[PDB]
Symmetry: C2
Subunit: 209 residues, 2 copies
Amino acid sequence: PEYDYIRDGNAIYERSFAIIRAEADLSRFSEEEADLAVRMVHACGSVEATRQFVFSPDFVSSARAALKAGAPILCDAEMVAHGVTRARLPAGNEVICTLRDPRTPALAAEIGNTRSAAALKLWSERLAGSVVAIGNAPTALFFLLEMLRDGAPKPAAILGMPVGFVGAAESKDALAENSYGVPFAIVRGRLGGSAMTAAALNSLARPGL
Amino acid sequence: PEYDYIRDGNAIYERSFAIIRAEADLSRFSEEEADLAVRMVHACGSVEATRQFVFSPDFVSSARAALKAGAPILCDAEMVAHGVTRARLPAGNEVICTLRDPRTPALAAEIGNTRSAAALKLWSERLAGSVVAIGNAPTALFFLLEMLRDGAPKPAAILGMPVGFVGAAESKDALAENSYGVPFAIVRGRLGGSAMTAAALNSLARPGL
């Protein structure tokens, strides 16, 4: 029983992107956004997810500029942070997730909110000009909107891609309604997740293969 | 602008599982398998993914027994390993991923295969009786089948859930055709991925919320 498969790593990424291009409806995206689209599709294995992707007008430019500028990537979840291929980052960008910071549970408890949300209080210094990747927790997304509403400094771009059935769609909708002036990208509805978010970051970091 | 959302972490998991139960077709799974199904759906946000889940007859029993027995979870990718909520493991089960072991690139090069695949040569001692979680790399799955064919000791269960467009479906199909006598669980077609795989592991570790 001889298994026949591509044993070549690069050949695998190459055929996979060739395949996603050949099956994915990418016409409504800019060339640049399509790049994110493909990697994102690469990451979830679902070519149809593209129908749910929404990139505000200057989302990739501003988020790519921020990253090239050295802007940190604030992540709501470690998984997102783990999916970020560092060798791809342009400027030794930091990938911060404070979800696991020891003060997070304490904060979540004092504020009456989730750990994912409360963690964002620990973003303070870094919020300004950052690229926010919210790949998992909707409450982190709503919380970021409350901080923005209440005068918090603004991120250069917000990847609003929490996945889920509770608050995921609405938080992303709230983002799209008024992101307080910050370019955004969302995956509509319940889809999203850290793999797709990290893919998105990966492509933002460096377009193409 | 008052954002109204559940600020309660447990309430969020609670409503999400209640929602997945209410929308997900779970009838063809056993009660036990449905548990995996829900968490898996929880993880990708897609209730329809359940249509692609396949649990061999004794997959959950043997994989849950293995884990309760203290069996390690061999993972093809770190992401899978990161999604495994340790506090859930039953018996201080080890979660091994050797994808990043320094000898992996070397091996991939000598064998003429991917790093994900070659890494599995480093599984040797642990393979027997383990629970294999292949959440990302199809070549790791094919390679595991070649090791099994060629006399390698058998895992107690194999989660064959690599996601992808190249080799993902076929490797999972090969698994289902002849897993060399090992219970398996696959996510048919291109869907799969580390979040869903880890969810699967999480549920195997401890059923329910």
